[PDB]
A paper describes a structure:
[name] consists of an N-terminal GTPase domain and two HBs.
[name] was expressed in E. coli, purified, and crystallized in the presence of GTP. One [name] molecule is present in the asymmetric unit. Four signature motifs wrap around GTP: G1 (P-loop), G2 (switch 1), G3 (switch 2), and G4. K200 and D202 in G4 engage the ribose. K46 in G1, equivalent to the catalytic R77 of human atlastin 1 (ATL1, another dynamin-like GTPase that mediates fusion of the endoplasmic reticulum), points toward the bridging oxygen between the beta-phosphate and gamma-phosphate, suggesting a role in charge compensation during GTP hydrolysis. Furthermore, the G2 of [name] forms a U-shaped flap on top of GTP, likely stabilizing the positions of several key residues in the catalytic core. Analyzing the lipid-binding mode, we found a tartaric acid (TA) molecule (from the crystallization buffer) bound next to the predicted TM region.
Residue numbers in the entry: -1 to 421, 457 to 594
C-alpha cells in the first residue's frame, strides 16, 4: 500500500517503542491478513460435473486432477503463491488445532487420504499454492471430492466446507436438470453460505444445454432459492487461453464467472477486510493512547489522580477477573457449548427416529426382498439429508452463541480503553462431513440370513416368513441409523470443542491486552507524581507530541471508512 500499509507500519513502530510486543504481533497478523486474505470459494457439486476442469481452465493451470473415473478424493484449497508449495491439513484429537504438514507439491495428484506423512490420522484437506494471477487478489478455491456416487460420501458432506467459506460455486453439467439431492443441497448451502452461483457446465457437449438452464432457473424460482445460473464451457475456455482468443473466451462465458467473482466475492470481501484492518489500526493506537493520556492527566490535573488511578485500577481488576474460569463470558461460552453439544445430538437422533419410523412402515408395507436396494437408497439419502439439516441447525446455533459471548464480553467493558471520566489466525478445521462409509454400501438384508439352506422338508407359512424378513430388515435399519448417529455425534462434539477453543483464545487475548494497556496507564499515572515541577513541562510536551501522533493515526484510519 501507500496509505494503509504505511499506517500499519507507522503504528507498529510506535508500539515497538512503547515495548508493546503484544500490539506489534497483533498488527503483524493484521498486515499478513490483508496480503494473503484467503477468500475461500467452494466448488461444490456431485461427481463428474466438471468441477476440477472448471478450476483448471479458470486458472489456466493443472492444479486439479481430472479423469473419467477417479480424480478428486480430498478437499483441495488453491491459493496464490509466487512459488509452488503444498501441505496436508491433519486432524488432532478432541477438536484441537489441526496440524500442517509440508509435502512436495506433486504428491497432490496422488490419493493423499492415506499420505504416509499423516501417520493414519485424518487428512481434513490439502492446501496448495499456484502462481496464477487470478489468485493474486486473494481468492482461494476449494475443489471438492467426488460425492453422490457409489462408495462416495453424500453431497451434503460438502456442507462442512461452507461455514469457513465466503462463496460457493455449485457445479452441475447440462446433461440433465437438477436432481432432488442437488436441490436439497442448494437450499442447505445457502443457509450457511448465501453468496453463491450455479455454474452450468459442458455447454460445448450438450446442444440442448439452454433448455436445461432455463428449466433449472424455473425450478430455482419455484423453490424460492435466489441463485444466479451461469452457463460455461471449460473446454472452450481452454482453447481460448491457448489461442489468446478474446472472442472464444467470451463464448466460453468464463468472463461471466469472473464478473460474479469480482462483484459478489472479491469486492465485497475486500471491503470487509479493509474495515477490519482499519479497526485493528485504530484499536492498537487507542491502546497506546490510554497510557499517554493517563500520564498527561496525572500531570495536568494532579487533584484528580485519586479518581484516575482508582478507575484505572478498577478496570484493570475487571480485565484480570475476565481471565478467570468464573468470568461470565467464559461461563456463557462453556455452558453454551455444553448445552449445544447435547442439543445437537438430541436434534439428530430426533430426526433419525422419525426417519427410522418411516422406513419401518415402508418395510411393513411391502416385500423387503423385492425392494432391498430401493429401501437402502432411500434410507441413506434421508439420513444424509438429516445430517445436513442437523449441521445447518448446529451452525446457526453456534453463530448465535458466539454472538451472545461477544455481547457478554463487550458489555463487561473488557475491550474498553477510553479515558476515565474526570475534571482466528490458527489452522481452520473445515473439512468434509462424515456420515456413512459410502453410498450404496448399506443393504437391509444381510449375507448369512439363510434363505437357501433355511428351507425344511416343509414350507414355512408366508405370514411368519414375512414377519421374520421384515423384523430382520428393521433390525439392520436401526443399527445403521445408530451407527451413523455415533459417528456424526463425534464429529459434532469435536467441532464444537474447536469453536470453544477458538473463541476462548480470542477473548483471553483481548483481556490480556486490555489488562496490559490499563496497567501501563496506571504506572504512567503514578510515575508522573514522582517528578518535580522543574521537569513537568519537558515530559508533558513529549506526551502532547506523542498524543498528537497517535490521534493522527486514529484520524487517518477513520477517514479510510
Ligand atoms: N465436453 C466437455 N467435457 C468436460 C468439460 N468439463 C469437464 N469435462 C469432462 O467431464 C469429466 C469430468 O471432469 P472433472 O473436471 O474431473 O469433473 P469433477 O466434478 O471434478 O469429477 P470428480 O472430481 O470425480 O467429482 C472429465 O472427463 C472431463 O473430460 C467441458 O467443459 N466440456
Ligand atoms: Mg474433481
Amino acid at each position: 500500500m501507500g496509505v494503509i500499509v504505511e499506517l500499519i507500519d507507522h503504528t507498529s513502530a510506535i508500539a515497538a517503542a512503547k515495548d508493546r510486543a503484544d500490539l506489534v504481533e497483533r498488527l503483524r497478523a493484521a498486515k499478513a491478513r490483508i496480503s494473503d486474505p484467503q477468500i475461500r470459494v467452494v466448488i461444490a457439486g456431485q461427481l463428474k460435473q466438471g468441477k476440477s476442469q472448471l478450476l483448471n481452465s479458470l486458472l489456466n493451470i493443472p492444479v486439479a486432477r481430472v479423469g473419467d473415473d477417479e480424480s478428486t478424493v480430498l478437499a483441495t484449497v488453491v491459493s496464490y503463491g509466487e512459488q509452488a508449495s503444498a501441505r496436508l491439513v491433519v486432524a488432532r484429537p478432541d477438536g484441537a488445532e489441526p496440524e500442517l504438514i509440508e509435502i512436495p507439491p506433486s504428491e497432490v495428484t496422488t490419493d493423499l487420504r492415506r499420505a504416509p506423512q499423516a501417520s493414519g490420522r485424518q487428512v481434513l484437506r490439502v492446501e496448495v499454492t499456484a502462481p496464477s494471477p487470478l489468485l493474486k487478489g486473494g481468492l482461494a478455491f476449494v475443489d471438492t471430492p467426488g460425492v453422490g456416487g457409489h462408495g462416495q460420501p453424500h453431497l451434503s458432506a460438502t456442507l462442512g466446507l461452507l461455514p469457513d467459506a465466503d462463496a460457493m460455486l455449485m457445479i452441475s453439467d447440462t446433461s440433465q436438470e437438477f436432481t432432488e439431492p442437488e436441490m436439497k443441497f442448494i437450499r442447505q448451502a445457502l443457509e450457511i453460505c448465501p453468496v453463491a452461483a450455479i455454474v452450468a457446465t459442458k455447454t460445448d457437449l450438450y446442444p440442448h444445454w439452454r433448455q436445461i438452464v432455463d428449466a433449472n432457473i424455473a425450478h430455482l424460482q419455484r423453490a424460492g432459492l435466489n441463485v444466479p445460473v451461469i452457463p460455461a464451457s471449460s473446454v472452450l475456455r481452454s482453447h481460448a487461453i491457448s489461442l489468446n482468443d478474446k472472442e472464444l473466451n467470451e463464448e466460453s462465458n468464463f468472463p461471466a464467472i469472473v464478473k460474479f467473482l469480482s462483484e459478489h466475492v472479491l469486492s465485497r470481501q475486500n471491503d470487509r477486510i479493509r474495515d477490519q484492518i482499519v479497526d485493528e489500526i485504530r484499536s492498537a493506537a487507542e491502546h497506546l493512547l490510554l497510557a499517554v493520556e493517563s500520564e498527561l492527566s496525572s500531570f495536568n490535573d494532579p487533584g484528580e489522580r485519586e479518581r484516575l488511578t482508582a478507575e484505572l485500577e478498577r478496570r484493570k481488576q475487571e480485565a484480570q477477573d475476565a481471565l478467570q474460569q468464573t468470568a461470565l463470558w467464559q461461563q456463557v461460552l462453556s455452558d453454551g457449548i455444553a448445552d449445544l453439544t447435547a442439543d445437537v445430538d438430541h436434534d439428530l437422533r430426533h430426526r433419525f427416529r422419525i426417519i427410522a419410523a418411516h422406513t419401518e412402515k415402508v418395510i411393513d408395507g411391502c416385500d423387503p426382498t423385492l425392494h432391498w436396494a430401493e429401501i437402502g437408497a432411500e434410507l441413506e439419502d434421508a439420513v444424509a439429508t438429516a445430517v445436513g439439516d442437523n449441521f445447518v441447525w448446529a451452525y446457526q446455533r453456534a453463530e448465535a452463541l458466539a454472538a451472545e459471548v461477544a455481547r457478554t464480553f463487550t458489555e463487561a467493558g473488557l475491550d474498553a480503553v477510553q479515558m476515565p471520566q474526570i475534571d482466528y489466525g490458527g489452522v481452520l478445521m473445515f473439512g468434509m462431513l462424515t456420515s456413512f462409509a459410502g453410498l450404496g454400501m448399506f443393504n437391509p438384508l444381510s449375507l448369512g440370513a439363510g434363505f437357501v439352506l433355511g428351507r425344511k422338508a416343509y414350507k414355512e407359512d408366508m405370514e411368519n416368513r414375512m414377519l421374520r424378513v421384515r423384523n430382520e430388515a428393521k433390525a439392520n435399519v436401526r443399527k445403521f441409523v445408530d451407527d451413523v448417529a455415533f459417528v456424526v455425534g463425534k464429529e459434532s462434539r469435536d467441532r464444537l470443542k474447536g469453536i470453544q477453543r477458538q473463541l476462548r483464545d480470542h477473548y483471553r487475548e483481548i483481556a490480556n491486552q486490555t489488562t496490559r494497556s490499563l496497567n501501563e496507564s496506571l504506572q504512567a499515572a503514578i510515575a508522573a507524581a514522582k517528578v518535580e515541577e522543574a521537569e513537568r513541562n519537558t515530559r508533558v510536551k513529549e506526551l502532547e507530541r506523542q498524543q498528537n501522533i497517535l490521534k493522527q493515526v486514529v484520524d487517518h484510519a477513520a477517514k479510510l471508512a
